[PDB]
Amino acid sequence: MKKEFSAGGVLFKDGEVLLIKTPSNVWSFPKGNIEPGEKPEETAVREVWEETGVKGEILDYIGEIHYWYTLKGERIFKTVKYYLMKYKEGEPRPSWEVKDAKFFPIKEAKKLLKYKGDKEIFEKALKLKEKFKL
């Protein structure tokens, strides 16, 4: 069993949340592997920009999710740390690794999300952002 560790962001702009559509056609949150020499917060900010071209600023830590996945028979146990972010600059645009990047009203975002962890993280992010007048 292999272990992986990523960090991502749940970024809001004027009430809407930033999402990306994966190659599998699933809408999820922008994230990436925590590279050697990076703290998870650094990874999250960098990955949001590389994947969506949007610059965000971390307001606080939201939570962590876990999931198992297989690839060509290998099994990997993956952990993703998510951070709440406020929109700073830029216009959503997909990286070469994603199909699309776009802002969605909270309501539509709820219907688009699929992964158990994403739904759980989103709910936590929503409660948490009210505190930051976001």
Ligand X SMILES: Nc1ncnc2c1ncn2[C@@H]1O[C@H](COP(=O)(O)OP(=O)(O)OP(=O)(O)OP(=O)(O)OC[C@H]2O[C@@H](n3cnc4c(N)ncnc43)[C@H](O)[C@@H]2O)[C@@H](O)[C@H]1O
Annotated binding site: 6, 31, 67, 78, 115, 118
CB 74 within 8 A of CB 83: no
What's the rounded Cα separation, in Å, for the pair 56 and 65? 21
| Paired tokens of 40 | 């998870």
Q: Is 25 in the site for ligand ATP (CB under 6 A)?
A: no
Question: Per-residue contact track with ligand X, 7 to 46, x per CB under 6 A?
Answer: ---------------------------x------------
Helix (H) or strand (E) holding 7: strand 2-13
The least distance separating ligand X from the CB of residue 20, rounded to whole angstroms, comes to: 22
What's the rounded Cα separation, in Å, for the pair 100 and 88? 19
CB 27 within 8 A of CB 21: yes
Binding residues for ATP: 6, 31, 67, 78, 115, 118
Query: Shortest CA distance to 6 belongs to which of 69, 96, 89?
Result: 69
Choose the binding region for ligand X from 1-9, 24-32, 55-63, 117-125 (rule: CB under 6 A): 1-9
Chain positions contacting ligand X, by CB under 6 A? 2-5, 34
Chain positions contacting ligand ATP, by CB under 6 A? 6, 24, 28, 31-33, 65, 67, 69, 78, 115, 117-118
